[PDB]
Design an enzyme around this catalytic site. Sequence first.
Site, short mmCIF file in Angstrom:
data_model
loop_
_atom_site.label_atom_id
_atom_site.label_comp_id
_atom_site.label_asym_id
_atom_site.label_seq_id
_atom_site.Cartn_x
_atom_site.Cartn_y
_atom_site.Cartn_z
N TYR A 173 51.45 26.60 41.69
CA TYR A 173 50.62 27.50 40.79
C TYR A 173 48.90 26.79 40.76
O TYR A 173 48.28 27.72 40.95
CB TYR A 173 51.11 27.24 40.03
N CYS A 212 44.66 34.12 30.57
CA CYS A 212 46.17 33.64 31.45
C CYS A 212 44.72 32.46 32.80
O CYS A 212 45.62 32.07 33.22
CB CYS A 212 46.40 34.73 32.11
N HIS A 213 43.43 32.81 33.26
CA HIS A 213 42.73 32.09 33.77
C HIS A 213 41.15 31.77 33.48
O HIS A 213 40.08 31.57 34.07
CB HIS A 213 42.99 32.34 35.32
N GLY A 214 40.92 32.47 32.52
CA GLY A 214 40.05 32.14 31.62
C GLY A 214 38.35 33.21 31.98
O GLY A 214 37.57 32.95 32.42
#
Lengths: 55, 373, 373, 48, 54, 240, 54, 49, 76, 76
Positions: free
Chosen positions: B271, E18-20
Site C-alpha cells: 500500500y 482515501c488519499h487526499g
Amino acid sequence: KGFSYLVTATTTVGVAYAAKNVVSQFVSSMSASADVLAMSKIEIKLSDIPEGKNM
Amino acid sequence: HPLFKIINHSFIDLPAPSNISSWWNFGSLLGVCLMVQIITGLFLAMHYTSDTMTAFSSVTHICRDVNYGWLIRYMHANGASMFFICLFLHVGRGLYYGSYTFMETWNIGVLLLFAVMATAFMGYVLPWGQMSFWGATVITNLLSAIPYIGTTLVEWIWGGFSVDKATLTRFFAFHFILPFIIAALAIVHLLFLHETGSNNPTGLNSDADKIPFHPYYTIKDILGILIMFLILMTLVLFFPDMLGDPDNYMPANPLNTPPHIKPEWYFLFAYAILRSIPNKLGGVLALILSILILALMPFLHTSKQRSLMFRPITQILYWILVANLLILTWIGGQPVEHPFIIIGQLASISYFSIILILMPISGIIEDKMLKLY
Amino acid sequence: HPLFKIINHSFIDLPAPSNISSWWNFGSLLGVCLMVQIITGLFLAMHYTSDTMTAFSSVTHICRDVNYGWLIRYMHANGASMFFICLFLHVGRGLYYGSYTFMETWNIGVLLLFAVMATAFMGYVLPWGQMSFWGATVITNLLSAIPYIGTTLVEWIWGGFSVDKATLTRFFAFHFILPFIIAALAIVHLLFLHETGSNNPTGLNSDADKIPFHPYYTIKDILGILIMFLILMTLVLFFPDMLGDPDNYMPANPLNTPPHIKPEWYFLFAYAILRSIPNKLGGVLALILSILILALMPFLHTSKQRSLMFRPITQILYWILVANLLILTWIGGQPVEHPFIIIGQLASISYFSIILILMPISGIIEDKMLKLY
Amino acid sequence: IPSRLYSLLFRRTSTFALTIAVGALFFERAFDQGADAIYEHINEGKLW
Amino acid sequence: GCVPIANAGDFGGYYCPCHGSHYDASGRIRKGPAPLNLEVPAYEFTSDDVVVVG
Amino acid sequence: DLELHPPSYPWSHRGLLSSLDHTSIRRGFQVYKQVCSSCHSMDYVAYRHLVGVCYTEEEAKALAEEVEVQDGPNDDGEMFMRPGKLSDYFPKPYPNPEAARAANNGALPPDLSYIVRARHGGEDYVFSLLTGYCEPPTGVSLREGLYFNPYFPGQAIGMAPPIYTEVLEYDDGTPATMSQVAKDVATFLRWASEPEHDHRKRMGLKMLLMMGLLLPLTYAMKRHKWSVLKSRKLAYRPPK
Amino acid sequence: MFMRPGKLSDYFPKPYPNPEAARAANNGALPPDLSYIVRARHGGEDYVFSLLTG
Amino acid sequence: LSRFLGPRYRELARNWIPTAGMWGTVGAVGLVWATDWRLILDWVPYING
Amino acid sequence: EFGNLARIRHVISYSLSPFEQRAFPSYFSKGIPNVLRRTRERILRVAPPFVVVYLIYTWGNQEFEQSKRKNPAMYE
Amino acid sequence: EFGNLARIRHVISYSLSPFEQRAFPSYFSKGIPNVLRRTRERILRVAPPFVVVYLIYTWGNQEFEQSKRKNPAMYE
Ligand code: HEC
Ligand code: HEM
Ligand code: HEM
Ligand code: HEM
Ligand code: HEM
C-alpha cells in the site's frame, strides 16, 4: 502431405472457432447480468437541494 | 504399497541437512496453516451465505448462534494473519540464506505468494462489512489503471458497474477454489525442491552431513507446530481484534465512506509503495514489482558464496531492507500528510535500490575482499 | 525437467497396449467430465446463493438474467448425467475384462464412486426445488436406520430437527469441496495404475506389443472427447429437460410432498434394492453392498483367464447382470404396487446371486472345460 | 493443386499456424452467416 | 474509487478521505493525486424542480 | 398414480430446430394479463424479458407504465408506489400466499412462471387442463370449489373454467376461441418457463454443423496416425 | 399481519421499520446499530463511555 | 551477456527472424480474432459484422 | 538417496545412545554463555537499522504532531 | 518404461508411413463384412437377456394396468 495437413488445418480452425465460442460465453457470463444492466432514469427533485448543498 | 515409497521418499528417508535452524520449520508451518485455513474455511462455509442482504447476518449468526462458531471464525482470521507471518519469514529465510538459486522452487514460490495474496484479499471482502466493501472497490479500481483494457477488466471482475452482490458471490467462489490450487502448487513446490534438497545456513554442500527426517526434523516440526498453535490460540482467545479493523464490524454502506481506508496489515508495505508513486499506473506497476522483484532475485546473485552467513556487508544491507520494509508497513498505516509521504517515497526508493543495485555491488566488493574477484 | 518428466512417463510415452478398444477411452472421458463439471460448477458459484429464501431465485436468475447462464446450468446438470453414464460404462469395462485384479486401482475406484454419488446427491439437493427437498429428507432419513447412533447422525447432518437452511448451506460447502478430493483420489487412481499399466481386451500379457500414447491413444481420446461433447451438447441444446424431473421446477414446500418422488436415473438401481428389502436397515445395508459388492469383486475371481473374451458362459452371466441392472433401473421408477415389487425383489436376489455365486462357479466350470481344473 | 498450397502455407509450421488463424478469423464470419441463414429460414415468420 | 466527502476540503467542493484529493464545487480535481475531474452524468433538466439524471 | 395422460399435440416449438411462434407468445401474454394475472403470479418474469421477444423497448415500457408498483421507502420512509418500470417484475396478485389461499377458496394458484416445466408434459397438460373441465361422471361427486378435470390430479381443481369462448379479445383480432386462447397461453407459459428456447436451438443447429465437420475429420486424423499400426504386418522368423 | 408478545426466540424490536424513518425522525442522522458498536468503534468501550460522558 | 554478443549467434538470429515474425503474426491475428477486436476487424471487409 | 549422496574418506564418527546421555547436559551452564557469544557476533550487523527505524518512527510521529499543531502566528 | 518391457526374439515387424497408405483402405469394402462377422459371434451371448428384459417390462406394464383396471363384478 497437403491433403493430410489441410485436414489438420481445417480441423484446427473448426476447433478454434468452437473453442473461442465456448470460452467466449463463459467469459461473458461474469459480465453484468440483465438485471443490473437494466438500470437507468433515476429521478431527482431539484427542490430537494438548496444552494450550497449536495445530494 | 508403491505409495508408501512416495510417502517415505518425501518425509521419512529424505536426506536433510543436519544443521538447519528453526527458520526451516516455517515452510512446514505454512502447510499446516494452509490445512488449518481450509478446515476452518470449510466450517465457515456450512453457515455462510454469499448474499449482500444476508452475508453480515450470516457472519453474526456464526459468531452468536453456531456452537463455537466464534472460535472457528476468529481462528480463520488469525490463521490468515499467522499464514502471512510465516510466509514473510519463509521469504526472508529464502532471501538471507541464498535459497533463491533453486530457481524453479523460487518461481513456484512467488506464484504461491501471488495466489495467497489474492485469496486473502477476496476472503477479507467476503464478510461484507464497511471496510470490506470500500477495500474491494479500492483494489478493484487498481485494475482500472491498465492503459487500454482496464475499464473492461474492472467491470468484468465486479460483474457490474460497481461492486455489489455480483462481486460478493463470485468472490466467494474464487476464495473457495484458490486454496486447493495453492495446495497443488505447494505439491509442485515440494517436488521442485526434493530434486535438489534443502539448503543449510552455512550455504555449503551438506552432502557429507545429512540425517533422516523422521526422528530429527519431524519432532522439530511438531515442536514448531505446537509453538505456532500457542501463538495462534493466544491471538484468538485473548486478543481477537488486535490485528483486525473495528470498522469491519459495521455493515457495508455504499453511501458512507470511511475517513481512512486500509487493507489488512500484510498488504501495507505494498500500500505504501502504491501511495508513494504519484502516477496511478506507476503505483500499480511498482506495487506489482514489489512482489515481483523477488522473482527477479535469482538473476541478481553476483557472489561466489550462496548464503549470507559469511557475508557481513550484505548482512547489513539485508537488515536495512528488513528495516525499511517495517517502515513501509508503518507508513501505510499513517494517513496522507507530511512527513509520512516523504518517508514513503524514500523508503520505496531505498527498497528498490537495495534489492536492485546495492546487494550485487556489495557482493562484488565482498568477493574482492577475499581475493576472489 | 522434473515437472515434464511426469508427463513424458505418464502421458507422452507411457507404454500402452496396442489393442485396447474404445471402452478404454471412457475413464479419460470421466476426467474430462470432472473438469467440465468443476468449470461449470465454478461458473454456477459466482451467482448461486445457498439461502433457502433465495436459492430458487438465484437459480432462476442464473437461467434468465446471466448471459448464457442457462447454458452453464444445463451443461452442469447434463454433465453430471454424462459423468454417471461414463462411470457406469467404466465400471462395466472393469467387470467384463477382469481389470479388478488390479486390486488397489479397483479399491481407489470404488472410493471414487462413493464420493461421486455423494457429490451428485448433495448437488441435486442444492437448487432447493420441491423434488430436492423431499429427496434430501428421504436419503437423510436413510441414515436414521442405523441401529443406535442413527438419530444423532441424521440430526447432525441436517444440522437441525429437519432439513432446512442449515442443511442447504452445509450441502453447498460439501458439494463444493468434494470434487477436488475426487481429483486427488483420481491422481492416486492413475498413480496406482501407472505402477501396473493398463489391461487389454484379450486379458493376456501385452508386454510384447505396446505402443506410445501420444500419437496413438491421444488422438483416440480426442476423438472420444469430441463424440462425448456431441452427445452432451445434443443433450443440452435439444432435449435439456429429458433427463430431469419436472417437479424440481416448483419451489420447495415443506408442507407438501411431490407425489412422484424418485431418485435420479443413476441412483435408481440402488433405490430399487432399498425398496425391495422389507427391513429398513436391511435396505440400507443392501444398498451399500450394491456399490460395495464391486470392491469385493477382486476376491471372487476364480478363473485362470483374466478377461471374458474367451469365456462364453461368464459372458452370458455378465449380460444377464447388465440386463437385471437395467431392470432394477426401471423398477425404481415404477411405483409401489404389484407386480413391480416382486420383480424388484427377484431382480435384487438375482443381482447378488450372479455376482456372489454364479460367476465363480461358472469360472470353475470353464476351467474344467479347458482341462485346466 | 494442394502441392502448391502445401509447399507454401502448410509445410512450414509457422505458416501452418498462420493459415489456420487467418482462416479461422474468416470462418466465423462465413459460418455464422451461413448458419443464421439456415436457422432463420427454418423459422421464418416466427422471429422478432 | 472512494466517495468524495461534500462540504469538506481546501477547495470548498469535495475531499476524498482515501488519499487526499480535493475537488472544487465543479468537481474538478484541484489538489492531490486524483487523475481526472469527477464525472458529470448526462442528466436532464425537465424542470427547475425535476432533473432526470441519466 | 391413476391420471389421464395428456396426448401429444403438434406444436411448433417441438421441432428439433424450431423456435416458438412469437405472435402466439404475444397473444398468450395478453391472455395472462387479462385473465390469469388475477390469481396466478409470475415472480421470476419481468417486463424487460419481453423486449426482443414479442415487444419493443418502447412498447414494453408502455406495458410497464400500465401497471402500479410499490417503490421501497420514501425519503420520509413511507413506502410509496410508482409507474411500472421495465425493471419491475410482474405484479403479485396476492401480497402473501395466505391472501391467495383465502381468495381462491383455499387453493394456491401456483406461480405460472415455470408451470410448464414443473408439470409433467406441461404444455400438453396446461392445454388439457384449461380445456378439460368436463362433467364429473356418475359415481364421483365433488365438493364446492372443485371441478372434475380429468387431467388435474384428483380431477378436482379449485380453478374454475378460466377460459370461456370469447373470454378476451385478441388485439391481433385472431378469433378468440377458447382453444385459440389455450394454445396461445400454453405457448406463452412455455416461453415463460424457458425464455431462451429460441436462442438455444440456434446454437443447436450450429453445434450439429460443427460436429458434422469436426467429427468426421478428427476421425481422419486418428485413422492417419493409426493406419501405421493397422498396416503393421508382423512375422516370426525363428532361426530355424 | 398481526402483533404478538415477544418470544425467547424473538430478536430485539426495531425502533423504526426502515432507516429512512430513522433519518426523518432524527433530523437527517441515522442512529447506528448498537449491537457491534463497541467492536466497530476504535477503542469502543472507551469511546462509548467518553461520548456518552463527553 | 558475453557469449551472446557473437558472429554466429547473430547469423543464427538472422536465420531465425522470419519464423519469429510469423509466430507473432499468428498471435496477433489470434488476439484480434479471439477478442473480436473490432477496431482492427472493422478494417476487414468481409469480417465486418 | 542415502548411499549415493557423497564421497568422504577416513572420517570416523562417534556417537551415544539417547537414553545413555543426559537430556540437557549443562543446558544453562553453557547455553547462556553461547547465546551471549552469539548475540555479540551478530548485534552490530542486526540492531542499528532497527534503532534508526525507531528514531524515524518517533520523528515522524512528533513531526506530524507539530505539523498538525496550529500555527500560532497564523490567525493573528 | 520402453526398453525394459519384455523380451521377444526373431519377430520381424514391417510397417508403412501414414501418408504413403490410403486413409480408409477398403473401409466399407471389408468393414461391413467384419462388423457383421463380429455381430454374429456375439449376438447370442448379448441379445436374449435384453429380449427377456423387454418381455418382463411389457409384462409388468400390462399386468400393472390389469391390476389397476376395475372389476365390475366387485361392486354387485
Ligand atoms: C389462463 C387461461 C390460465 C391458465 C393457463 C391457468 N389458469 Fe389457473 N388456477 C387458479 C387457482 C385457484 C388454481 C389452484 C387450484 C387448485 O390447486 O385446486 C389454479 C391452478 C392452475 C394450474 C395448476 C394446475 C396444477 O396441476 O397445479 C394451471 C396450470 C393453471 N391454473 C392454468 C385460479 C385461476 C384464475 C382465477 C379464477 C384464473 C383467471 C386462472 N386461474 C387462469 C388460468
Ligand atoms: C478451501 C478452503 C477455504 C474455505 C472453504 C474458505 C471459506 C471461507 C468462508 C466461508 C469465509 C467467510 C466466513 C468468514 O467471514 O470468516 C472465509 C473467510 C476468509 N477466508 Fe477463507 N476459506 C478457505 C481457505 C482460506 C485460506 C487458505 C485463506 C488464506 C489465504 C483464507 C482467508 C480468509 C479470510 C481472510 C477471510 C475473511 C475472514 C474475516 O471475516 O475476517 N481462507 N473463508
Ligand atoms: C504456500 C505457502 C508455502 C508453503 C506451504 C511452502 C512449503 C514449503 C516447504 C514444506 C518447504 C520445505 C521445508 C523448508 O525448507 O521450510 C519449503 C521450502 C522452500 N520454499 Fe516454500 N512454501 C511456501 C511459500 C513459499 C514462497 C512464497 C517461496 C518464495 C519466496 C518459497 C520458497 C521456498 C524455498 C526457496 C525453499 C527452500 C528452503 C531452503 O532450502 O532454504 N516458499 N516450502
Ligand atoms: C468444485 C466444482 C463444483 C462447483 C463449484 C459446483 C457448484 C454447483 C452449484 C453452485 C450448483 C447449483 C446450481 C444449479 O442448480 O445447477 C451445482 C449444482 C449441481 N452440481 Fe455442482 N459443482 C461442482 C462440481 C460438481 C460435480 C463434480 C458434480 C457431479 C458429481 C456436480 C453435480 C451437480 C448437480 C447434479 C447439480 C444439480 C443441478 C441441477 O439443478 O439440476 N457438481 N453445483
Ligand atoms: C472418478 C471417476 C474415474 C476416473 C476419472 C477414472 C480415471 C481413470 C483413468 C484416466 C484410467 C486410465 C485410462 C483407462 O484405462 O480408461 C482409468 C483406468 C481404470 N480405472 Fe478408473 N476412473 C474413474 C472411476 C473408476 C472406478 C469407479 C473404478 C472401479 C470400478 C475404476 C477402475 C479403473 C481400472 C480397473 C482401470 C484400469 C483399466 C484397465 O487397465 O483395464 N475407475 N481410470
